[PDB]
Amino acid sequence: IVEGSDAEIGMSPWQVMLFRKSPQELLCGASLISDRWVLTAAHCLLYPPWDKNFTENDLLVRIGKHSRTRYERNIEKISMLEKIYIHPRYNWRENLDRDIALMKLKKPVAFSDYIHPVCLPDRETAASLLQAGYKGRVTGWGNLKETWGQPSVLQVVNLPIVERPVCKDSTRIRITDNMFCAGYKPDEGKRGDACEGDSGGPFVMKSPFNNRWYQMGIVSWGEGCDRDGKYGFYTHVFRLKKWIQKVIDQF
Amino acid sequence: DFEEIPEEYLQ
Amino acid sequence: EADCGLRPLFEKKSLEDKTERELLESYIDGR
Ligand SMILES: NCc1ccc(Cl)cc1CNC(=O)[C@@H]1CCCN1C(=O)[C@H](N)CC1CCCCC1
Ligand code: NA
Ligand code: NA
């Protein structure tokens, strides 16, 4: 996260770290959506241009964390993966369209003060909140700068959703309805973005109607990090919710 | 860089 | 979960985090 701040304890209790077993390293962010299901970006698991194609036994999830590198004894919980599900129309060849994946845990995780699921939006909450200018929150343990370094604890940044024409005009990549973009414009002064290692983490909004947190996006892609005139692009969770529900219902 | 995690999670 | 999106150390205790108001102030519809 570029130009963010240290998270408060328990501020993002749905935060998940995707952790490679060997070598032991951070792979991505993710989010807890129930006691058995974790949501992430497909490119965290499958990205052939970078020779990335993980199987379940390559990975662990670490839930309840705050420190990036510490083993947070009596606080974090580490879970093994039963199965990965990647969207069948995930487009890793062109533009990361449908950049979404689910991971089912081998065993349910116990909720605590530090471990708790985020809601997924329904159609009405998405329509109400996914509007240009409305701010969401991105969290992660990724890089603090595009070029460097890395944070001691989970980082947080609040960013406004951007008008679709501005998103389109900021890039040569073909944008789709399964993406939205967020970030400040050069003229707005404030800044901030996700960066490498924040992939797969959540873009959340707090509904002013029922005071619950909803995951509206998944950290997906950006040209650099926090560059003037660029924006971060996020998987549109509601647009892909029918797939989410089909997977969870079936498996 | 990362603190070792209990071996039970790697088995 | 029927309890989704309500944080134990914040919403459950009626405590606010240091920047959630910035989000609320940006939600300029329905108010
Ligand atoms: N830049 C870090 C970053 C910044 C913001 C956000 Cl939201 C996510 C992220 C993290 N996300 C990534 O690194 C992803 C992983 C794969 C490449 N990538 C990028 O973002 C490529 N630069 C552009 C792709 C190239 C592929 C076509 C779509 C465009
Ligand atoms: Na364009
Ligand atoms: Na920018």
β-bridge mates for residue A5, sequence order: A156
Same domain, A8 and A47: no
Q: Would you say A162 and A231 are in contact if contact means Cβ atoms under 8 Å apart?
A: yes
Question: What's the gap between Cα A47 and its chain centre?
Answer: 16
Task: Provide the residue ranges of all domains of chain C, joining segments of one domain with +.
Answer: 1-31
| Helix (H) or strand (E) segment spanning residue C14 | none
Q: Give the CATH number of domain C1-31; options: 4.10.140.10, 3.30.200.20, 3.40.50.970, 2.70.70.10.
A: 4.10.140.10
Q: Cα(A54)–Cα(C30) distance, rounded to whole angstroms?
A: 44
Secondary structure of residue A11 in the 3-state scheme: coil
Distances, alpha carbon A95 to alpha carbons A101, A222, A244, in Å? 16, 11, 21
Question: SS3 helix, strand, coil % of chain B, rounded to 5?
Answer: 25, 0, 75
Q: Cα(A209)–Cα(A66) distance, rounded to whole angstroms?
A: 29
Same domain, A86 and A173: no
Q: Mind giving me the DSSP string for A171-204?
A: -SS---TTEEEE---GGG----B--TT-TT-EEE
Probe ligand 1: pick from A91, A221, A223, A234, max atoms within 8 Å of CB?
Answer: A221
How many CB atoms neighbour CB A123 within 10 A? 9
User: Resolution of the experimental model in angstroms, please?
Assistant: 1.5
Same domain, A180 and A233: yes
Distance from CA of B7 to the nearest CA of A (A): 11
**Look-up of token digits 């909803």:** A214
Whose CA is closest to A3, among A136, A202, A144, A140? A144
Same domain, A92 and A138: no
C4 touches chain A (CB under 8 A): yes
Secondary structure of residue A141 in the 3-state scheme: coil
Among residues A31, A79, A199, A220, which one is catalytic?
Answer: A199
Q: Cα(A246)–Cα(A89) distance, rounded to whole angstroms?
A: 14
Total count of residues recorded for chain C = 31
Q: Do A25 and B4 touch (CB under 8 A)?
A: no
Same domain, A71 and A3: no
Residues of the domain holding A39: 13-117+239-251
